[PDB]
Symmetry: C3
């Protein structure tokens, strides 16, 4: 259970980092995004 | 503790999926968003 | 392990709340964002 939760949490960290990059690109208009 | 963490992690998955949909809509301009 | 996971989950909640605010601002154009 705990190890599986560690994996789901890391997966969420990956998804959140991607969202952060995409949101910063939209907020700042980077490269015309 | 562990079961409560499982619930919080699932709640985060729900919030992250919603954010992903909203961000993709903004990035692609779907339906004028 | 479990307490460390509790901390990572709270950190994710903070990041997700920030993303939600930023996305709502972009979706609604708040304050010209």
């Amino acid at each position: 259970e705990v190890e599986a939760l560690e994996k789901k949490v890391e997966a969420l960290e990956v998804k959140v980092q991607k969202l952060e990059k995409k949101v910063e690109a939209l907020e700042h208009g980077w490269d015309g995004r």
